[PDB]
């Protein structure tokens, strides 16, 4: 085979997206309301349950870092203390925007400080013939104008969840992708609000004069307006009139705004990949049994795919460079970042541990149950419970 | 192989997704400069098409790609690409079927009915105000006259509790919201599209009476699982044959003729049901069979793996001894 | 029958606007006159909360969505097709009363097996 | 999930911007220590926690049980660190 | 720390409440006359606004407060205040977003 891609990658030199489009994503994100909350819920499901760092053969890595023994996992946990917050910030960005992008920061002494997220709407990638990002172009507001700068791709890092293809290094914004559904939702919402004001409430119509009788002029209606003014009317006002005054009602004219809302919310939630329930909307037959199992399974599969995409790229583009550049450890070690399942039920895990715990090592039980594994290696590695080993040791 | 393909989960989802959308998934083998294996690199399937011989085998690959407001074209030999086909016309079809081009009619029908519902809601979903001016067989009202009436009844400046005072010859009429069952049209469209794409109706956020329970539910979810197995097996076989075995042959000390299997996990497996099974019939299963079903690392100790009673039961008897 | 349902939904599934112009037994309205009325009531440029101001001799009528049970026609078609191909009705994403449970269910799933 | 995100954001910043400066300036202790502020889950059910403790308590140290159950940890270190119940240790110590 | 922050439950609710309503919770460190720690003293968040440098870090705090039918103004260095932001535009935002000003339209729509 060959060492360079011999297949071409479908973009160079243009006719993918502008700083104006990047600021449209910012506008949707900061505009609030139902669209912004749904995409926040999406970020929380994918990234909000927090993280764990696994190194395979971690104990083998035992080394004095600074007059104290650490493993690579222990070092990485010190290097990234607030990785839960970083994962939610970057994961949220990579769902909204085409990418999450950022720097590596150093203390003045030259030790690692942080992975510093940049503002994704301010940055766009410049790519070669094989689609790899060579440089980053930044535009930022100051003093009523815009500063511009180009940064080399050598000292930024970036993460793409939504790819057009497995070769796409630039990615797709879900907001720009679903822009039509988003605007359709927003327009129908405005239409409902305006319609409720006009048509949701009855309005008083007073008709003055006899039909085919004497004409009534504007100054005449001004005096009738004073008598029937809704501003000064109270609930139990009574009206005394001649036969030639008619009090009529423009009724509240029925429309099913609830059904229009449910339709809009269904369209938007399905487009953004969330279940209908996230929109505060219910549906018949879907709330129970194997119908429910399927939809919640589809959601969990989507979460796993996004989580794995993020995990791999974060370990490769952020953690491994940091281990290489600022650490005494080997950067080629098997680092994994796992992101927790948001919809995991510990009651179901506990039921499983009762039924089939006789086949699991104590560390496998502790992993499922989200606990520190036993301190004693022979206790961790054995199959029967640590409490059962203790009562037998105490008996002996 | 696990070291050679570390992120095989992602590659499987990318390639498998491509092979469901497109007629094929296609890609290269790549080498480090030193000549060790780097990766299987998926190409973009819309950019590539196969050229086939008289017996339908792919001889060459023709690539068209956009650059600088035009298109580059190139031809590559079939010798150094690989490809995978899930959807076939026949077991001899090396080119395959796109499900999207196959079901193009249902896709466009869905999109058109959707657009029609949206336009119909705009026109007919909301009441509209019709002010009628003048007496019937009375004096005619002209456009300039209606402009002044428009100013009095403008929906833009109207509040919820505005009151109207008029003479007898102004009629405030309503174009009602005209009832149509857009919900039923949506359900029909979603039923047509889901059944065409082979998904159960529930995937479309649409429910159905009598189908959600009992043996009716069992059948439809069994049909979905059978479809998943068939696609998985097709992909598994071709990936091992066209990607993994060549990589073992060319970049490895091992025998390429070994029984390599790629299993792709069942998405709808219930671990609670597996645990129930292990309670009822665990007495007939080796500890490695139990570990495989339960998705655990097999026991490190061969006799413990190979035995039928629990590893914990063996530990309490060894402890008693 | 599928094609018939699709064509019928387009024609009859949605309401349509009928603007009638002129007095009954009044002055006749010609095509060029209706072109200007079309410009005023164009569904393309109309929004949901548009209001109309007219004289007495403009009528905004509606062709209603005319009811037909396309769901029942689909169920019938699917029943015919599934029974002909020997599949249970449930394979076609169609339910049926009384058949979903008990010894009725046992028989049909036994027949399939 | 939304509550957890807000809680962690607050917790981290309060430790970094309020607590660590106070430990530095007014305390004999090391300010670089691993301080955490946890903010309690408002919708936690103690019945569910108690059910969990019955099912898998055989895998938890007594301090882990005490932490989940919102109790003070056992005073005796070997009792805190052991896996079987402190009451079960007592009835065996009494039997002995 | 438990002796230093005895009423931390009340403080967490006050500051956390402020940081959900306003862009930030903000306040001082206060000392006894002897120079021991007294308290973290929350300031009134509607009275204070941050001044930021080019990299968005808060350098000074500008305070406006009502007295005697007018307003007093003062500027304070960022060195002796502290602040907490729950709602951020980006991970680099030290100023934050008010959920109230963000959702102002829905709030007014509801009230109307
Ligand atoms: Mg007269």
| SS3 per residue for chain B | CCCCCCCHHHHHHHHHHHHHHCCCEEEEEEECCCCCEEEEEECCHHHEEEEECCCCCEEEEEEEEEECCEEEEEEEECCCEEEECCCCCCCCCCCCCCHHHHCHHHHHHHHHHHHHHHHHHHHHCCCEEEEEECCCCCCCCCHHHHHHHHHHCCCCCCCCCCCEEECCCEEEEEECCCCCCHHHHHHHHHHHHHHHHCCCHHHHCCCCCCCCCHHHHHHHHHHHHHHHHHHHHHHHHHHHHHHHHHHHHHHCCCCCCCCCCCCCCCCCCCHHHHHHHHHHHHHHCCHHHHHHHCCCCCCCCHHHHHCCCCHHHHHHHHHHC
Cβ pair E25, E90 in contact under 8 A: no
Q: How far apart are CA E83 and CA A9, in angstroms?
A: 48
Q: How far apart are CA D7 and CA B231, in angstroms?
A: 44
Q: H or E element: which one contains A158?
A: strand A156-159
This structure was determined by: cryo-EM
Across the interface, whether the CB atoms of A30 and E92 are under 8 A apart is answered no
Q: What is the CA radius of gyration of chain B?
A: 33
Q: Which two structure tokens, joined as six digits, stand for A87?
A: 């994962």
The strand ranges marked E within E8-101 are 25-31, 37-42, 48-52, 58-67, 70-77, 81-84
Q: Burial of B220 by CB count in 10 Å (0-12 exposed, 13-18 middle, 19+ buried)?
A: buried
List for chain C the helix, strand, coil content (%; round to 5): 45, 15, 40
Query: Which residues are paired to B251 by β-bridges?
Result: none
Q: Which two structure tokens, joined as six digits, stand for B138?
A: 């009375």
User: For the sheet containing B128-133, what is the strand order?
Assistant: B170-175, B128-133, C52-54
Q: How far apart are CA A53 and CA C72, in angstroms?
A: 56
| B91: closest CA of chain C, how far (Å) | 24
Name, in order, each residue with C-beta under 8 angstroms of C4's C-beta and a sequence gap of 6 or more: none
Angle between helices A179-199 and A33-47 (to 10 degrees): 140
Buried b (16+ CB within 10 A) or exposed e, D5-24: bbbbbbbbbbbeebbeebbe
Name, in order, each residue with C-beta under 8 angstroms of B316's C-beta and a sequence gap of 6 or more: A384, A388, A392
List of chain A residues whose C-beta atoms are within 8 Å of the C-beta of residue E91: 86, 89-90, 116-117
| B314: closest CA of chain C, how far (Å) | 43
Name, in order, each residue with C-beta under 8 angstroms of A305's C-beta and a sequence gap of 6 or more: B13
Q: Tokens 């004073």 label which residue?
A: A226
Across the interface, whether the CB atoms of D56 and A88 are under 8 A apart is answered no
Cβ pair A334, A56 in contact under 8 A: yes
A-B interface: how many C-beta pairs under 8 angstroms?
249
Residue in D with minimal Cα distance to E25: D10
List of chain B residues whose C-beta atoms are within 8 Å of the C-beta of residue C5: 188
Across the interface, whether the CB atoms of C95 and B208 are under 8 A apart is answered yes
Q: How far apart are CA A95 and CA A100, in angstroms?
A: 9
Q: Which of A317, A316, A269, A275 has the alpha carbon at shortest distance from A299? A: A275
Across the interface, whether the CB atoms of D10 and E5 are under 8 A apart is answered no
Q: Which two structure tokens, joined as six digits, stand for B56?
A: 């339908």
Cβ pair E28, E45 in contact under 8 A: no
Cβ pair A12, A129 in contact under 8 A: yes
Phi, psi of A76 (to 5 degrees): -60, -35
Q: Which of A177, C44, C7 has the alpha carbon at shortest distance from B112? A: C7
Test mutation, E90, E102, E111, chain A, max A CBs within 10 A: E90
Q: How close is the Cα of A213 to the center of ligand 1, in Å?
A: 7
Q: What is the CB neighbour count within 10 angstroms for residue B108?
A: 10
Q: How far apart are CA B287 and CA A359, in angstroms?
A: 7
**Dihedral of alpha carbons D34, D40, D46, D51, sign:** negative
Cβ pair A72, A326 in contact under 8 A: no
Q: How far apart are CA D45 and CA D62, in angstroms?
A: 20
Nearest to E103 among A32, A117, A119 (CB): A32
Nearest to A6 among B76, B122, B182 (CB): B76
Q: How far apart are CA C99 and CA B210, in angstroms?
A: 9
Test mutation, B3, B5, B138, B163, chain A, max A CBs within 10 A: B163
Question: D interface toward A at CB cutoff 8 Å?
Answer: 1-2, 4-5, 8-9, 12, 48, 51-52, 55-60, 64, 82-84, 88, 92
Residue in C with minimal Cα distance to B135: C56
Q: How far apart are CA C19 and CA C37, in angstroms?
A: 8
Q: Which of A144, A125, C24 has the alpha carbon at shortest distance from B137? A: C24
Q: How far apart are CA B17 and CA E72, in angstroms?
A: 65
Resolution in A: 2.3
Name, in order, each residue with C-beta under 8 angstroms of B250's C-beta and a sequence gap of 6 or more: A1, B29, B37
Q: How far apart are CA B315 and CA E84, in angstroms?
A: 54
DSSP for residue A134: E
Query: Which residues are paired to A133 by β-bridges?
Result: A127
Phi, psi of B260 (to 5 degrees): -80, 130
Got the DSSP string for A198-252?
Answer: HHSS-EEEEEES-TTS----HHHHHHHHHHH-TTT--TT------TTEEEEEE--
B-C interface: how many C-beta pairs under 8 angstroms?
127
Q: Which three-class secondary structure state does DSSP give residue A113?
A: strand
Q: Given a contact as 3+ CB pairs under 8 Å, which chains touch B? A: A, C
| A24: closest CA of chain C, how far (Å) | 25
Sequence length of chain C is 113
Question: A interface toward C at CB cutoff 8 Å?
Answer: 191, 194-195, 198
Q: How far apart are CA A340 and CA A43, in angstroms?
A: 13
Across the interface, whether the CB atoms of A276 and B205 are under 8 A apart is answered yes
Answer whether B touches D (≥3 Cβ pairs < 8 Å). Answer: no
**Dihedral of alpha carbons C98, C104, C106, C108, sign:** negative
Got the DSSP string for A329-355?
Answer: S-TTS-EEEEE--TT--HHHHHHHHHH
Nearest to D17 among E5, E12, E82 (CB): E82
Q: How close is the Cα of A212 to the center of ligand 1, in Å?
A: 9
Q: How far apart are CA D33 and CA D45, in angstroms?
A: 32
Q: Which of A218, A121, D15, D29 has the alpha carbon at shortest distance from E90? A: A121
Cβ pair A9, B28 in contact under 8 A: no
Q: Burial of B125 by CB count in 10 Å (0-12 exposed, 13-18 middle, 19+ buried)?
A: buried
Q: Which of B268, A60, B123, B316 has the alpha carbon at shortest distance from C42? A: B123
Q: Which of D14, B150, E91 has the alpha carbon at shortest distance from A121? A: E91
**Residue B214 backbone zone (phi > 0: left; psi -120 to 50: alpha; other: beta):** left
Phi, psi of C54 (to 5 degrees): -140, 165
Q: Which two structure tokens, joined as six digits, stand for B290?
A: 């139990």
């Amino acid at each position: 085979a060959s060492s360079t891609p011999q297949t071409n990658v479908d973009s160079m030199g243009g006719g993918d997206l502008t700083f104006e489009d990047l600021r449209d994503i910012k506008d949707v994100r900061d505009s609030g309301g139902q669209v912004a909350q749904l995409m926040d819920y999406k970020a929380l499901l994918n990234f909000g349950e927090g993280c764990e760092i696994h190194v395979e053969g971690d104990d083998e890595t035992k080394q004095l870092v600074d007059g104290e023994p650490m493993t690579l996992s222990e070092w990485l946990e010190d290097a990234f203390p607030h990785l839960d917050l970083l994962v939610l910030d970057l994961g949220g960005d990579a769902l909204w925007y085409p990418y999450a992008v950022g720097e590596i920061q150093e203390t003045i002494t030259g030790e690692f400080k942080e992975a510093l997220p940049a503002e994704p709407w301010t940055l766009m990638p410049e790519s070669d013939a094989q689609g790899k990002v060579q440089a980053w172009h930044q535009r930022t507001k100051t003093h009523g104008g815009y500063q511009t700068q180009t940064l080399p791709a050598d000292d930024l890092w970036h993460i793409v969840i939504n790819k057009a293809s497995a070769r796409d290094e630039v990615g797709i914004s879900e907001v720009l992708r679903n822009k039509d559904e988003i605007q359709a939702f927003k327009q129908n919402e405005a239409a409902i609000n305006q319609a409720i004001e006009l048509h949701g409430f009855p309005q008083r119509h007073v008709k003055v004069g006899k039909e085919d009788g004497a004409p009534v002029r504007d100054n005449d209606l001004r005096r009738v307006r004073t008598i029937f003014d809704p501003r000064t009317t109270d609930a139990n006002t009574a009206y005394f009139t001649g036969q030639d005054v008619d009090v009529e009602t423009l009724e509240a004219h029925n429309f099913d705004y609830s059904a229009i809302h449910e339709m809009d919310m269904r369209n938007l939630t399905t487009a953004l990949g969330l279940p209908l329930e996230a929109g505060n909307v219910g549906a018949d037959g879907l709330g129970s049994g194997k119908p429910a199992e399927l939809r919640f399974a589809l959601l969990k599969l989507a979460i796993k795919a996004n989580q794995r995409s993020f995990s791999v790229q974060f370990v490769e583009r952020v953690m491994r460079p940091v281990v290489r550049d600022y650490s005494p450890f080997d950067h080629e070690a098997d680092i994994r970042l796992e992101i927790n399942d948001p919809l995991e039920d510990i009651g179901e895990v506990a039921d499983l541990i009762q039924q089939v715990g006789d086949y699991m090592t104590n560390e496998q039980v502790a992993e499922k149950l989200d606990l520190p594994a036993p301190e004693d290696d022979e206790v961790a590695d054995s199959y029967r419970s640590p409490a059962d080993m203790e009562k037998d040791e105490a008996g002996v």
